[PDB]
Amino acid sequence: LIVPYNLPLPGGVVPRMLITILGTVKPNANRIALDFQRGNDVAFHFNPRFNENNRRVIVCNTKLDNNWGREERQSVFPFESGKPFKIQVLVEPDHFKVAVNDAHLLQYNHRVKKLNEISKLGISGDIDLTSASYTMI
Ligand SMILES: OC[C@H]1O[C@@H](S[C@@H]2O[C@H](CO)[C@H](O)[C@H](n3cc(-c4ccc(F)cc4)nn3)[C@H]2O)[C@H](O)[C@@H](n2cc(-c3ccc(F)cc3)nn2)[C@H]1O
Ligand SMILES: [Cl-]
C-alpha cells in the first residue's frame, strides 16, 4: 500500500473493533505515526520516535482545534529498524489498547468522547505498509 495511507472507519469506532496494521520498518527509520481523526482533530496520535535525543520513545497525544495536549510517553519500544511488525489497536469502552507483535504495549484513555465521529485512520512515516484492516471481535 502507498504511505501515507487513509483507512476510513465507517460510522466511527466502537468497542470490540480491532484494527490490525502489518508492515516493515524502513532501515534508518526516524518516525511512524497512526492518527485516529475526528474531522481536523486527532483523537489519538501514536508516534514512535527512533531518535529523540538518542533515545527511542513512543509519544501519544490528542490534537484539538490545532493544539496538542499533554503527552503520554512510553519508553518500552518494540519496533526495530528493518524488521516486520504487527500493530493491533483494540477499542475498549474507556481506552484504546495497543499491542505490538502480540505483546501488550500501552492503553490510552479516551479524551475525545464522541467515538462514532472518529471515522478515519491515517498511517504515515518510515514504513513499508503491507496491510491495514479492521474486524469486530
Ligand atoms: O505531542 C505530539 C506532537 O509532538 C510534536 S513535537 C513536540 O514539540 C513540543 C514543542 O512544541 C515539545 O517540544 C514536545 N516535547 C515534550 C517533551 C517532554 C520531555 C520530557 C518529559 F518528561 C515529557 C515530555 N519533549 N518535547 C515535543 O514532543 C510533533 O511535531 C507532532 N507531530 C509529529 C508528526 C508526525 C508527522 C509524520 C510522521 F510520519 C510522524 C509524526 N506530526 N506532528 C506530535 O508528535
Ligand atoms: Cl468529544
How many angstroms separate the alpha carbon of residue 47 from the centre of ligand 1?
Answer: 9
Q: 107 exposed, middle or buried (CB, 10 Å; 0-12, 13-18, 19+)?
A: middle
Q: Which fold has domain 1-137?
A: Jelly Rolls (2.60.120)
**Separation of CA 73 and ligand 1 centre (Å):** 10
Give dist(CA 125, CA 30) in Å, integer.
Answer: 8
Choice from 40, 53, 59 to test ligand 1 binding pocket (greatest atom count within 8 A of CB)? 59
Grid coordinates standing for 101? 507483535
H helices, E strands: number in the chain: 0, 12
Per-domain boundaries in the chain: 1-137
Binding-site annotation: residue ranges for a beta-D-galactoside: 68-74
Strand, helix or coil for residue 7: strand
Buried residues in 48-66 as b, exposed as e (16+ CB within 10 A): bbbeeeeebbbbbbbbeee
